[PDB]
């Protein structure tokens, strides 16, 4: 026999519990639920094999190459606290398995086929260790936090944004009107809703025209630099470029894209274009919860956060913790650090499985958005600090006096909280009192507080860490 044909167990080749990862290896931590009767290390070895070099039966062509140098290895399997059917499998991938600068390629290996194997009932990619040598093949954010603050001339507070509402159905001129009222009242930013692209009720070129008239008008009237994230999410790359170029032509400082629904190939192209054209890039994570909501299967957002920082955006939505969409506090604080800091040590209490070095890649502004209002401002400033964008869509356009009043209420609330923090006050303990202080001289804030008093979003969290 030329070689030994037939089926072997994956663990014979792809389970190596004595392997020491190299500093250039890509590491993955998978939460794996084997079928009953499948040894955990066989299920983990199947994931390692079928995301690197192996298939289901022995092939002679392995002998044409140096499989020892190319195979992924499951080097550690650990039980999960509180679940005797789940394991964390740690898998190491050699650096030269991956196309340089291509999250698309990385995904095609790490999450390409292994989530569908019969032998594995459920699989969740919890974290990845991206080595510095692979990070250096990526652009990173077009600008990043420090450059963006310098480009906007804004220092010492979170930035404030706002999604226009109703989500769909407004005309272009009405879009410009509501944008003008929002920005002129004290918001730094407004934005297209993630599903506002180009539609019969409002075509994109009309929207861009009327919106940018509003942006420039509000900037001149207030004296503060303004922006509206014009959405370039589009069916084709050609349309996406056309929309980005027209935003630039009209003098917008900023665009947005739905990076997951558009996808990583178009996203990577657009991030490069934003670097080349000096355009701030706001990333909306539409569709992410299809993938990242459930604790037993999918990809945790902290992984997506690494991938999108690598490809590059200047803002990314990260959740609110306290708003209408779910965001586990501990995990959120964790991946906010992963998005902003240069070194993040492993921390089980925040779901950080690996130390992560960013080798001077700029940080990305976290964006807290969705079902938040003025009473949340103390905690939002506490959770995220200065380097965040806080967005109030309904919390601005739902002000009883309209958009300019709603914008002023949010801007006053923010500045009062920031002032109080800087003075040494405990803004979490004194948050309600700080807001009431400002409401004494700001009727706009007073009315916003009356409108949303005792509106809260408190539910049992689905995506929690292990106990």
């Amino acid at each position: 026999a030329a070689y030994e044909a037939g089926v072997k167990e994956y663990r014979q080749t792809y389970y190596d519990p004595d392997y020491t990862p190299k500093d250039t290896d890509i590491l993955a931590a998978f939460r794996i639920t084997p079928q009953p009767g499948v040894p955990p290390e066989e299920a983990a070895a199947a994931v390692a094999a079928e995301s690197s070099t192996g298939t289901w039966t022995t092939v002679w062509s392995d002998l044409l190459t140096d499989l020892d140098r190319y195979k992924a290895r499951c080097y550690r399997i650990e039980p999960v606290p509180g679940n005797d059917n789940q394991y964390i499998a740690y898998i190491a991938y050699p650096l030269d398995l991956f196309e340089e600068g291509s999250i698309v390629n990385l995904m095609s290996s790490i999450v390409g086929n292994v989530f569908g194997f019969k032998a594995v009932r459920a699989l969740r990619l919890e974290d990845m260790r991206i080595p510095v040598a692979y990070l250096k093949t990526f652009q990173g954010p077009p600008h990043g936090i420090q450059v963006e603050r310098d480009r906007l001339n804004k220092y010492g507070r979170p930035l404030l944004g706002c999604t226009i509402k109703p989500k769909l159905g407004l005309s272009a001129k009405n879009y410009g009107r509501v944008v003008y009222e929002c920005l002129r009242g004290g918001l730094d930013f407004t934005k297209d809703d993630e599903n506002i692209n180009s539609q019969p009720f409002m075509r994109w070129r009309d929207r861009f025209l009327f919106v940018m008239e509003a942006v420039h008008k509000a900037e001149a009237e207030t004296g503060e630099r303004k922006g509206h994230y014009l959405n370039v999410t589009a069916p084709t790359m050609e349309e996406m470029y056309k929309r980005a170029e027209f935003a630039k032509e009209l003098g917008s400082r900023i665009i947005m894209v739905d990076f997951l629904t558009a996808g990583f190939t178009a996203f990577t192209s657009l991030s490069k274009w934003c670097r080349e054209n000096g355009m701030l890039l706001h990333l909306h994570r539409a569709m992410h919860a299809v993938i990242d909501r459930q604790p037993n299967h999918g990809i945790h957002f902290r992984v997506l956060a690494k991938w999108l920082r690598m490809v590059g955006g200047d803002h990314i939505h990260t959740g609110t913790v306290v708003g209408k969409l779910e965001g586990d506090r501990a995990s959120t604080l964790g991946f906010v650090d992963l998005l902003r800091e240069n070194y993040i040590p492993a921390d089980p209490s925040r779901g950080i499985y690996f130390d992560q070095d960013w080798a001077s890649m700029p940080g990305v502004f976290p964006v807290a958005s969705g079902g938040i209002h003025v009473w949340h401002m103390p905690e939002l400033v506490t959770i995220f600090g200065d380097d965040a964008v806080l967005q109030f869509g309904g919390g601005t356009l739902g002000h009883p006096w309209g958009n300019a009043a709603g914008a002023t209420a949010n801007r006053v609330a923010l500045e009062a909280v920031v002032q109080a923090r800087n003075e040494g006050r405990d803004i979490l303990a004194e948050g309600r009192e700080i807001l009431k202080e400002a409401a004494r001289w700001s009727p706009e804030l007073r009315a916003a507080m009356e409108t949303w008093k005792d509106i809260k979003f408190e539910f049992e969290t689905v995506d929690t860490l292990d106990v």
Partner: protein, 102 residues
């Protein structure tokens, strides 16, 4: 003419300004003073009053410089800045004095 951070609050008293300077120093950041007669959104570079006060140890030192800048430039806007060389960027910038024609 709004002037970015704290512009939507009532004008700060000298006592409130000093608390912000103390916040800058307490965190190991460098206080500075800038001024201009051209405060609009086109101007990234207000005039430096001296250099950022790398050697400042007390907030009172900075308030004295602020008063001196105001006396010399009463028709100008004057801002206090806080600067971090580790992130390499300003951590705080707010207007402390607005001229009569504001």
């Amino acid at each position: 003419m709004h002037t970015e951070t704290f512009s939507y609050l009532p004008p700060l008293t000298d006592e409130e300004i000093k608390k912000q300077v103390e916040y800058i120093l307490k965190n190991g950041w460098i206080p500075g003073i800038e001024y201009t007669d051209e405060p609009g959104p086109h101007n990234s570079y207000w005039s430096f009053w001296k250099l950022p006060f790398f050697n400042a140890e007390t907030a009172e030192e900075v308030m004295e410089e602020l008063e001196a800048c105001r006396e010399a430039n009463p028709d100008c806007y004057i801002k206090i800045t806080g600067y971090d060389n580790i992130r390499q960027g300003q951590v705080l910038s707010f207007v402390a004095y607005r001229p009569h024609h504001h």
